[PDB]
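Form 12-C: Joint structure prediction
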Amino acid sequence: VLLCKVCGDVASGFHYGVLACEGCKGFFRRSIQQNIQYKRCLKNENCSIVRINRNRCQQCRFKKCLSVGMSRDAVRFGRIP
Amino acid sequence: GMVLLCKVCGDVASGFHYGVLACEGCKGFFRRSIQQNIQYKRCLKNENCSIVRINRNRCQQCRFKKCLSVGMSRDAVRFGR
DNA sequence: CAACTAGGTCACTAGGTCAG
DNA sequence: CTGACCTAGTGACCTAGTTG
Ligand SMILES: [Zn+2]
Ligand SMILES: [Zn+2]
Ligand SMILES: [Zn+2]
Ligand SMILES: [Zn+2]
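Section 2 - Result
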């Protein structure tokens, strides 16, 4: 049913204010718990991301996350209303 | 003067819990803190932390301080009208 | 009795692991 | 570095019990 609004994979829950997979989620937290910048992207930084190529572009995977809406200020603990 | 506010995180108030207008969240969070030996792991950003809807869950320490600081207490319960 | 609230549950999910 | 799996919490919903 519901699939990750980042790489299209099956969503594991409502994470960071967005319906995402365990992969993007984990990667996402990992990304902000360290403002550390991933290397730049070789191909005009518009690397379309999918279940298959997500791990290819870190700097775009990350932006995508930001782009879709994933934040610390968007966490919805609890039960689905 | 409707839609009273949880006097801790400003979130909406579901009622008058433990002596003060609170939200299910902070409400549950309180009876949970006292009804246990629960001793939260020390604060990180200079015991002060702002508590609001978005961040309330980040520093457990301050949150509890905040509750106690607004009046929440087991002895001030009002089952009235 | 009717407008309320403690308490209890249990559906959800950050965060932390650690084996590929 | 990534992502499957757990666990300690979080808070939306209910209901037993308490007042006016
Ligand atoms: Zn994903
Ligand atoms: Zn890119
Ligand atoms: Zn609150
Ligand atoms: Zn704090």
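Section 3 - Comments
Residues 1-81 of chain A form a domain with the Erythroid Transcription Factor GATA-1; Chain A fold (CATH 3.30.50.10). Residues B 6, 8-9, 11, 22-23, 25-26 surround zinc ion (ligand 3) (CB under 6 Å).
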